[PDB]
């Protein structure tokens, strides 16, 4: 039985003969065929592309082990990867019809590390087209929640790793791989009671990952426990000699430390009990716990959509935060209610607060380049680097098919995305400039880091804060949010459409660690607790999250996917 089993217990069974790599692959496939495939009562639709060589790779794992030569701690451990990941031999559509026949000619760096370690990819998980959204249906549709069919498995507007969240929580594999541009990593993890880690810039190479916004894309591993997440990072986190596609590891204007310089000697050693929280100071933004009436009191708040508006947290989510704060205080930690200039100075939600568009730290022309010229190059250079003879140029892509609207669903609120994605093909036909010749890049990248220094780094120092904590999301949107107007208003509200922090978290290179905060008593939906801190302080944040996880049993098995 593999339901809610840890990597250590699986490796333990592999070394004792109680199971084999092949038998683990078959155990997970039985749960996929019983809960994930179409025609089943649940039909969660998380695993959308199968790896036909999973059994062949599993047989090779048992052959290496029978010979007393395991490749390492993850030899024979199944996992899933977001459809944005390049997995050699399999398609890489990014959930988009226009790329449905694109074949990965090689692996992504995270997949290359796992394959060399003997880990076997069972398949790829669902996502909206190009990760440009959350719960919108792509070429493979969308994934459903294993905790409550009446609610989404991820934020509707930014939660593109919805398949990775559902699959990991339902034990369709030992762990999962996700990706985040806004909240596509923290979002799905929150609704499924998962542990997630968004690293600082350049810690995990994004080479071989379908980009969305090269300045913000990061690799996000999923795990049902902090122990499992540390098992994963111990293998994937390593220096990558090939920097192609990774903008932050290519640019020379801003210094970025090597991954081998940021990572600890042993990630599993970062685990600790409640002692790691004694004498620590943690700040919780009032805006994420229904304690900031000043949010949204400016003349024209926000920078588009529901940004810059007051967040109404669900009462059942407040009750879990109250018990989470009590656990922190009982462990000797100090929780302080504070402002959050990182969000307020980005969205201009109160009088005097500037926005990223008018503050002057980054030019307006860079923000234009950041989402048009720079992203079009990201799409084009990814196709050129992969090198599929059938499709290796963005100019040769069916534009209108990159993100076609789902007929019968409510129109997108941010704006039209069918013609918006086709525009990137128009730019590729007129000529795309590469990353290193975009004039606004040197000032923009230095301005992004400076923004974090003022709003977060120096801010945390003068407040003597060790980390910043807050509920990952304020509420969950109903599953019918795509067709029900009443549900759309809930799902598209601030704090719900996107995990707390909106774009400023990923825009400024802020590391985060998310852990389950508990399950809502009313609707039985999990909600997470996010730990954020200074850049490249990742080891401390991972330790804090592991310490908080040890003080409670805040994860349950999804009721829709019981053990077979």
């Amino acid at each position: 039985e593999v339901t809610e089993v840890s990597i250590a217990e699986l490796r333990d069974a592999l070394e004792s003969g109680r199971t084999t790599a092949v038998e683990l692959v078959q155990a997970y496939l039985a749960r996929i065929d019983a809960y994930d495939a179409p025609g089943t009562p649940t039909a969660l639709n998380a695993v959308v592309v199968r790896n036909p060589d999973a059994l062949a790779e599993a047989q090779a794992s048992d052959a290496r082990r029978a010979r007393g030569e395991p490749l390492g701690p993850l030899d024979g451990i199944p996992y899933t990867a977001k459809d944005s990941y390049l997995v050699k031999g399999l398609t890489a559509a990014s959930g988009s019809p226009a790329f449905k026949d694109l074949v990965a000619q090689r692996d992504a760096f995270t997949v290359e590390r796992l394959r060399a370690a003997g880990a076997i990819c069972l398949g790829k998980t669902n996502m909206p087209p190009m990760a440009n959204g959350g719960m919108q249906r792509g070429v493979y549709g969308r994934a459903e929640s294993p905790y409550n069919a009446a609610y989404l498995t991820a934020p509707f507007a930014s939660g593109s790793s919805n398949g990775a969240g559902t699959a990991t929580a339902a034990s369709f594999a030992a762990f999962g791989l996700a990706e985040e541009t806004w909240s596509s990593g923290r979002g799905p993890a929150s609704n499924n009671g998962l542990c997630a880690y968004t690293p600082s810039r350049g810690v995990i190479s994004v080479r071989g990952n379908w980009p969305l916004t090269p300045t913000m894309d990061v690799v996000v591993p999923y795990a049902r426990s902090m122990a499992d997440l540390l098992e994963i990072l111990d293998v994937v986190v390593a220096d990558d000699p090939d920097t192609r596609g990774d903008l932050w590891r290519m640019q020379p204007w801003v210094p970025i430390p090597k991954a081998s310089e940021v990572r600890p000697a042993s990630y599993p050693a970062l685990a600790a009990g409640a002692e790691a929280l004694a004498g620590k100071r943690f700040g919780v933004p009032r805006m994420f716990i229904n304690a900031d009436p000043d949010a949204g009191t400016s003349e024209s708040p926000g920078i588009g959509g529901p940004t810059g508006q007051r967040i109404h947290t669900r009462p059942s989510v407040i009750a879990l935060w109250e018990q989470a704060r009590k656990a922190l205080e009982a462990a000797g930690a100090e929780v302080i209610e504070v402002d959050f200039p990182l969000v307020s100075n980005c969205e201009g939600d109160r009088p005097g607060a500037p926005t990223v568009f008018n503050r002057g730290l980054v030019s307006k022309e860079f923000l234009h380049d950041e989402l048009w010229e720079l992203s079009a190059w990201g799409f084009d250079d990814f196709l050129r680097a992969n090198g599929d003879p059938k499709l290796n140029r963005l100019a040769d892509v069916d534009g209108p098919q990159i993100f076609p609207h789902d007929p019968g669903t409510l129109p997108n609120r941010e704006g039209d995305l069918a013609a918006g994605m086709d525009e990137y093909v128009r730019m590729a036909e007129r000529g795309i400039k590469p990353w290193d010749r975009i004039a606004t890049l040197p000032d923009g990248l230095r301005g992004l880091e400076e923004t974090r220094r003022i709003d977060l780094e120096e801010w945390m120092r003068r407040l003597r804060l060790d980390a910043v904590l807050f509920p990952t999301v304020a509420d969950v949107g109903p599953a019918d949010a795509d067709v029900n107007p009443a549900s759309a208003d809930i799902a598209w509200s601030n704090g719900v459409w996107v995990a707390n922090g909106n774009l400023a978290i990923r825009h400024l290179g802020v590391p985060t660690v998310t852990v389950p905060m508990g399950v809502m008593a009313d609707i039985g939906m999990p909600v997470g607790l996010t730990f954020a801190g200074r850049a490249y302080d990742d080891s401390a944040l991972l330790r804090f999250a592991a310490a908080f996880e040890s003080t409670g049993s805040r994860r349950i098995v999804p009721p829709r996917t019981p053990p077979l």
């Binding site: 990760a131 440009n132 959204g133 959350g134 507007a157 930014s158 593109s160 541009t181 806004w182 596509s184 969305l212 916004t213 300045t215 913000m216 920078i303 588009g304 959509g305 990223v356 568009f357 923000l367 950041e370 989402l371 720079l374 992203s375 941010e414 459409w497 996107v498 774009l503 825009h507």
Partner: peptide, 6 residues
């Protein structure tokens, strides 16, 4: 909700 700052 997904691309850069818009």
């Amino acid at each position: 909700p997904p691309l850069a700052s818009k």
